[PDB]
RNA sequence: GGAGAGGUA
């Protein structure tokens, strides 16, 4: 559940490990949970592009949006 | 072994057969279809999830990146189905899918992911089905019945002689693919070998023999058989198969072994070919001229010069003898040829064939396919690639490999979607050896080569082909670059797929509106099996072939039930106990007969299963054992009876009543009717319309209790229990304690649909038929719908009929009623009729329904209230104003001429951001009163149910019955008791109270947004305000009613009581058929039914002069056990001693209005039994009794013949036809008088009598009708003047429909004109 | 006004 941010979309929220089929290729990838739970599942060998979220407002970070009278 | 409920009334019945297998749930083909359509399959194999998993997923074309499927969902219905059908939407549900974009990396190698996306996209909307299986569109409740199309696969036909005149038939063969291009194989009147493509122009097959890649030498191989000659030191001794010499005759002398084994001019004997095979020769010395006409199998070559001698396929001639033996040449391979074995019907298309080469015979393929557009290299071949063995494009589904298969002899049942080399070479290879003459002809009326296909397929191949194109879209979107940045929403369009679903269910040649005056109507309709629509032949294109019963329709298809007129044998109807195969097929069950034993366990077998084996009929008068009384027992072998011994039998019918449909298994004496005039008794017994109170047929065919309950009308309770509180409008069961489910016990509840417009105009609703403290059982009858009665079904009225023609007023077929009928008034049938009237929004600003109108006395305002809008429960008459509306600048809604009745509902609509005026607020409040009030009934009652299972549970264990009542309920669950699973029902019970709690909390708000929330509408449109009339036809002269015999008739007049025939015991007759139209239509099911109904008229009789007395129990239930006997071994074996002594009361009420009587279809009452039930009455056997005239008093003679007889009123009422018309509208175009009665129309003086009238010497009247009652407008407006001035003169003029026509042409370039 | 579906004689 900890905040991350990817720099190619945005702010997410980390919501663990899993395995996927890829064309025959069963790879590991880490999920994050985006706007309208849009899931998003980054290789784990491209682990560079997931850092720790910075603001200081890891229960007040936003979540971007995936993509009188 | 009697319900407490069936003991109300408990059928006599006849019949001895003893009954197997009883009939299953008649509505279940549909339900099945559409459940295996939307479900969620792991084997991918049915419905939504294999299209999905077909279609995706999708490659570009580089393709760096592709779109593949996961996974979908269905959303909750927005609305319920009252709500759809009110407001008039389908009753759908969202489809969402979780699509999944891939990414690769381009310079890294094939394969590899760079990144990975995915959304739940939504896309369409699919109607979903109810829980009959009917579905709802926009309010208007239509049905969908099966197709019967011919099955995907192969088929050998031949045209029988029919073309050429030469008498030669001419056999063809067709491959038919579930999806892709048909496929064709010719016969050639001169054995030339055709291929055809979709009916596309001819081909001789050897060219697409080639397209795979197949030489002349390698289909010589594959299609014939070789013949070795030998150039040796003695010219040409010749190997010899002796197989090959039968039917040819010795030209020369064969000699071998130094034995002539026969001569020229000699006939080849079998006893040639045994002293032949006995020597045991194989090689014959054969003259040169044996070889004079011969063809070489393969081409030779010199080996030295490397050049052709004799390429393939060619001649054989003495100076080529010279040059394959100074070439050395040893064996020398040539063609076994026949004329009546084998043919060389390759060896001429061969020569036929223009080409010769792979490229070529592609290339004019395409030419052949595509007309001009020169091609290329590339084109051909791709063409015929992507053409007939691209999955994308050509399928044979399952069904069609295991066919395929089948009809090869194959082993496989399972296979490939696509053709391969050894499938088209083995079809020729088949259709060849019919040609020669093994294997046979293939009929296509057989049952076992036509498929029923329900809904499910239907619409899953149109959700495919609209997946179809956003599949095109998103492929050309990828085949684009910028990726980077896509997702997978913009890509995706709902409409496509949108539209492609919803115009095939609203608007299809198969999804038809459902007649629904009659439950029987819907069940008939719903189990309807239809040949035409897509795919299936035309109406008016079709043979005596297709419209004639097939032997195979035998316990499949009901043979005597069918529209007739235009469309026979088309619109055939389901046997009774026919299933459908897991492939489509129509499979009836079978009782299995072992050695000698008949058991009980049955097998559903298919239409080609049964060509096999043997089958002896229903009625086969076996004795406790299976061990048939009889040696020669009737049975059909295989498309015809015969009779066979009493052990080679291997499978007997389930009963008598698996040959006809469930309408017509309703008519009692059908084994005696003539087979049309029972077809049009079935027909008509689907038209007729709910009485008033129905009335239970005296003599029934025991299939009633079946199709009321399995028609949806009635409420029949689920879980048998107690009636806790009734009324006119809902029902409450306290559930029986066995039944409850551990948790959540609460108690069953019902709710009545009370007068409802139905699909025909005639109102229906429910009445209860129990009272308070009712003990009730599972599956059993609750709420009467329309014409019913207990739980049967009861669609007219039985009356007191008698035969004799009477003062000619029942002539031809007109029936003269007396005028009890009426009086009494039990044929009075109500009708609903809905009008609209709607606010444009026009030029000259809008129009609204202002109470005020010009020009208009205050007498007709009198019935509008302040708003413009009738008061509910007016009672409006013909040429009245229901809504006042305004000319901008009168067009108030006005009753329709002539029509009577009494407004019941009215319903308005807005569009949304539109003020409301009063009325309209009025009805909200009115309706958020009514549903607040009818929630709170229901809590509460839910509540009571819960305290009193919490109080039920609390009566062990603790139980102070005055602890109960001193606290109230408020504070009951809290209560201390030993520690068990006691005390976590109790927490249960508790928690459900709480839930309830806030489920009503929160229903009321959501009841409360969908009432107060605005309406759609269709553009310009500003309002709609809609008004239900409610009129009672009750008859007249005039009216169509029948008997069940296919004995219709017009009512032709009411007479007075005192007219009417009378017995000398003092009742009136009601009914005065004519006795003439028995003989010539032979239906004498109607005269024994009378003399039946007659008794059992006569039995409840004396049971009611019984009663009338006080009579004790004592002689009642002796009368009535003694009545329940006296058949012939009957299986009723209905005993009375077990009796309460007071059910036995309740049941002699319920028959002091006669004995119902059973009758199964061909197992029926013999005249014998009826004389005898007759004979326990004091009636005369005979059935005839003498009658006294009503106006003069004295006897008739010759003995009567009366009885009862059960009767319908149609659904063609005299005040719906009766019209006409003096001077009205006018067409536009042409200017004549509208067509309809709908408009104010004028009827059509057609030509046959026009040319009737010229048959007279009448001209005048002929040229005034066609010119100035119709036509010249100036001359129909003087003639109206002279007629208003009586003057009756007319001017002809000319007519204004010929000057049309005189522009039309000269539209054209012809210039036409009128001389001088 | 025109299409399509169903139905009656």
């Known amino acids: ?42 290789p784990v060998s491209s682990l560079h592009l997931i850092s720790r979220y910075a603001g200081g407002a890891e229960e007040n970070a936003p979540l971007h949006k995936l993509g009188v009278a | 072994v009697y319900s407490y409920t069936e003991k109300k009334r408990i059928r006599k019945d006849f019949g001895k057969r003893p009954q197997v297998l009883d009939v299953p749930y008649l509505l279940s083909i549909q339900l099945d279809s559409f459940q295996k359509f939307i479900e969620q399959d792991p084997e991918g194999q049915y419905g939504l999830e294999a299209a999905f998993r077909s279609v995706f997923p999708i490659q570009s074309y580089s393709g760096n990146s592709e779109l593949q499927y996961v996974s979908y969902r269905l959303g909750e219905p927005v609305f319920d189905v009252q709500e759809c059908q009110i407001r008039g939407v389908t009753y759908s549900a969202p489809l969402r899918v979780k699509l999944r974009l891939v990414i690769y990396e381009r310079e890294a190698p094939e394969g590899t992911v760079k990144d990975i996306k995915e959304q739940e996209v939504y896309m369409g909307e699919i109607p979903l089905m109810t829980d009959n299986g009917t579905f709802v569109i926009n309010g208007t409740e239509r049905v969908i019945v099966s197709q019967l199309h011919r099955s995907p696969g192969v088929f050998f036909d031949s045209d029988k002689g029919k073309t050429h005149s030469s008498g030669k038939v001419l056999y063809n063969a067709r491959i038919i693919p579930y999806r892709g291009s048909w496929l064709d194989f010719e016969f050639d009147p001169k054995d030339n070998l055709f291929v055809r493509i979709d009916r596309r122009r001819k081909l001789p097959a050897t060219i697409i023999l080639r397209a795979l890649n197949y030489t002349t030498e390698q289909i010589l191989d594959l299609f014939f058989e070789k013949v070795i000659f030998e150039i040796r030191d003695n010219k040409l001794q010749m ?59 393969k081409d030779y070559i010199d080996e030295s010069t490397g050049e052709l001698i004799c390429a393939a396929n060619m001649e054989l001639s003495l100076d080529l003898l010279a040059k394959l033996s100074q070439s050395g040449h040893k064996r020398i391979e040539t063609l076994f040829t026949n004329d009546l074995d084998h043919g060389p019907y390759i060896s001429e298309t061969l020569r036929v064939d223009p080409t010769n080469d792979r490229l070529s015979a592609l290339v004019e393929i395409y030419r052949m396919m595509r007309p001009g557009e020169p091609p290329t290299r590339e084109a051909a071949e791709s063409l015929f690639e992507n053409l007939f063995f691209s999955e994308d494009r050509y399928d044979l589904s399952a069904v069609g490999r295991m066919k395929f298969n089948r009809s090869l002899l194959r082993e496989e049942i399972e296979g490939s979607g696509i053709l391969s080399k050894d499938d088209i070479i083995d079809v020729m290879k088949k259709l060849i050896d019919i040609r020669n003459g093994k294997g046979e002809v293939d009929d296509i009326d057989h049952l076992g080569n036509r498929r029923i296909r329900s809904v499910g397929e239907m619409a899953e191949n149109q959700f495919r082909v609209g997946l179809v194109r956003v599949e095109r879209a998103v492929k050309e979107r990828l085949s684009l670059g910028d990726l980077d940045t896509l997702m997978p929403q913009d890509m995706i369009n709902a409409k496509p797929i949108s539209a492609a679903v919803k115009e095939f269910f609203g608007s299809s040649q198969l999804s038809q509106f459902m007649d629904q005056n009659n439950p029987l109507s819907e069940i008939t309709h719903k189990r309807r099996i239809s040949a035409l629509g897509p795919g299936g032949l035309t109406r008016e294109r079709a043979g005596f072939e297709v419209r004639d019963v097939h032997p195979t329709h035998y316990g499949r298809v009901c043979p005597i039930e069918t529209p007739e007129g235009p469309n026979i044998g088309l619109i055939n109807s389901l046997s009774v106990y026919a299933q459908t195969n897991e492939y489509g097929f129509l499979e009836t069950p079978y009782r299995k007969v072992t050695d000698g034993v008949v058991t009980d366990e049955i097998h559903y077998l298919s239409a080609i299963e049964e060509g096999n084996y043997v089958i002896a009929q229903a009625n086969s008068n076996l004795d406790e054992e299976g061990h048939f009384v009889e040696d020669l027992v009737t049975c059909r072998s295989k498309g015809e009876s015969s ?181 009494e008034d039990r044929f009075t049938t109500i009708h609903i009729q809905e009008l609209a009237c709607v606010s444009r929004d026009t030029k000259l600003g809008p129009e609204e329904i202002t109470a005020d109108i010009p020009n208009v006395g205050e007498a007709a305002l009198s019935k509008l209230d302040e708003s413009g809008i009738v008061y509910i429960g007016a009672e409006v ?65 839910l509540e009571a149910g819960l305290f009193s299972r919490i109080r039920a549970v609390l009566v062990a264990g603790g139980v102070e019955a005055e602890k109960l009542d001193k606290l109230p309920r408020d504070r009951w669950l809290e209560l201390g008791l030993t520690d068990e699973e006691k005390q976590n029902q109790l927490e249960q019970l508790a928690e459900q109270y709480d839930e309830l709690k806030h489920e009503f909390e929160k229903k009321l708000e959501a009841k409360r947004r969908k009432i107060t929330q605005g309406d759609d509408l269709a553009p310009g449109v500003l309002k709609i305000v809609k008004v239900y009339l409610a009129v009672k036809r009750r008859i007249q002269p005039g009216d169509k009613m029948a008997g069940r015999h296919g004995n219709k008739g017009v009512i032709s007049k009411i007479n007075p009581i005192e007219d009417m025939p009378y017995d000398e015991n003092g009742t009136p007759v009601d009914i005065v058929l004519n006795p003439l139209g028995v003989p010539s239509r032979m239906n004498i099911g109607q005269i024994l039914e ?67 009587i059973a009758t199964p279809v061909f197992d029926g009452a013999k005249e014998a039994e009826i004389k005898e039930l007759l004979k326990l009455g004091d009636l005369p056997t005979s059935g005839q009794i003498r009658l006294y ?36 509208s006018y067409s536009l175009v042409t200017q004549q008088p509208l067509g309809g009665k709908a408009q104010f129309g004028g009827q059509r003086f057609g030509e046959m009598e026009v040319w009737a009238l010229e048959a007279y010497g009448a001209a005048y009247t002929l040229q005034e009708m066609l010119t100035v009652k119709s036509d010249d407008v100036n001359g129909r407006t003087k003639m109206y003047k002279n007629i208003v001035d009586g003057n009756h003169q007319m001017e002809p003029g000319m007519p204004e429909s010929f000057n049309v026509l005189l522009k039309e042409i000269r539209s054209l370039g012809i210039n036409i004109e009128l001389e001088d």
């Not at chain 2, 009796?1139 to 036995?1144: A, I, K, R």
């Open chain 1, 1 to 42: 559940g900890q905040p991350v941010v990817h720099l190619e979309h945005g702010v997410g929220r980390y919501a663990g490990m899993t395995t996927l089929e890829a064309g025959g290729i069963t790879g590991e990838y880490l999920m994050l949970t985006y706007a309208n739970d849009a899931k998003l599942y980054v």
């Open chain 2, 239 to 297: 190997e010899l198969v002796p197989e090959r010499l039968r039917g040819e005759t010795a030209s020369f002398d064969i000699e071998a072994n130094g034995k002539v084994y026969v001569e020229k001019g000699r006939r080849i004997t079998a006893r040639h070919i045994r002293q032949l095979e006995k020597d045991d020769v194989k090689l014959i010395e054969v003259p040169v001229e044996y070889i004079a006409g011969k063809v070489v199998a």
């Open chain 2, 643 to 823: 009779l066979f011994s009493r052990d080679q039998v291997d499978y007997m019918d389930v009963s008598t009543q698996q040959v006809v449909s469930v309408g017509a298994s309703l008519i009692p004496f059908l084994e005696h009717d003539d087979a049309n005039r029972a077809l049009m008794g079935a027909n008509m017994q689907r038209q007729a319309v709910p009485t008033l109170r129905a009335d239970k047929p005296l003599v029934g065919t025991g299939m009633e209790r079946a199709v009321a309950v399995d028609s949806g009308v009635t409420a029949v309770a689920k879980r048998g229990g107690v009636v806790q509180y009734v009324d006119a409008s809902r029902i409450v069961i306290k559930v029986n304690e066995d039944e409850m489910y551990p948790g959540e016990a609460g108690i069953d509840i019902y709710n009545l649909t009370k007068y409802t417009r139905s699909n025909q105009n005639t109102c229906i609703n429910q009445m209860p038929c129990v009272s308070l403290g009712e003990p009730v059982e599972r599956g059993d009858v609750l709420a009467d719908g329309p014409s019913t009665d207990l739980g049967e079904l009861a669609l007219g009225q039985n009356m007191r009929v008698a035969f004799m023609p009477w003062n000619g007023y029942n002539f031809e077929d007109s029936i003269l009623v007396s005028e009890r009928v009426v009086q």
């Open chain 2, 877 to 941: 008459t013909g040429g009245d104003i229901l809504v006042g509306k305004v000319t901008p600048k009168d067009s108030s809604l006005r009753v329709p001429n002539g029509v009577s009745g009494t407004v019941i509902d009215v319903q308005v609509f807005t569009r949304d951001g539109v003020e409301k005026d009063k009325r309209a607020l009025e009805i909200e409040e009115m309706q958020l009163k009514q549903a607040k009030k009818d929630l709170s009934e229901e809590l509460q009652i």
């Open chain 2, 1090 to 1156: 009378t003399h039946l109904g007659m008794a059992a008229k006569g039995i409840g009789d004396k049971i009611n002069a019984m009663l009338k007395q006080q009579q004790e129990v004592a002689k009642l239930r002796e009368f009535i056990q003694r009545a329940y006997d006296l058949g012939a071994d009957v299986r009723q074996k209905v005993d009375l001693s077990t009796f309460s002594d007071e059910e036995v009361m309740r049941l002699a009420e319920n028959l002091r209005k006669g004995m119902p």
């Open chain 2, 1189 to 1224: 005239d009503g106006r003069t008093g004295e006897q008739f003679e010759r003995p009567v013949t009366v009885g009862y007889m059960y009767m319908l009123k149609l659904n063609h009422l005299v005040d719906d036809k009766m019209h006409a018309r003096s001077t009205g």
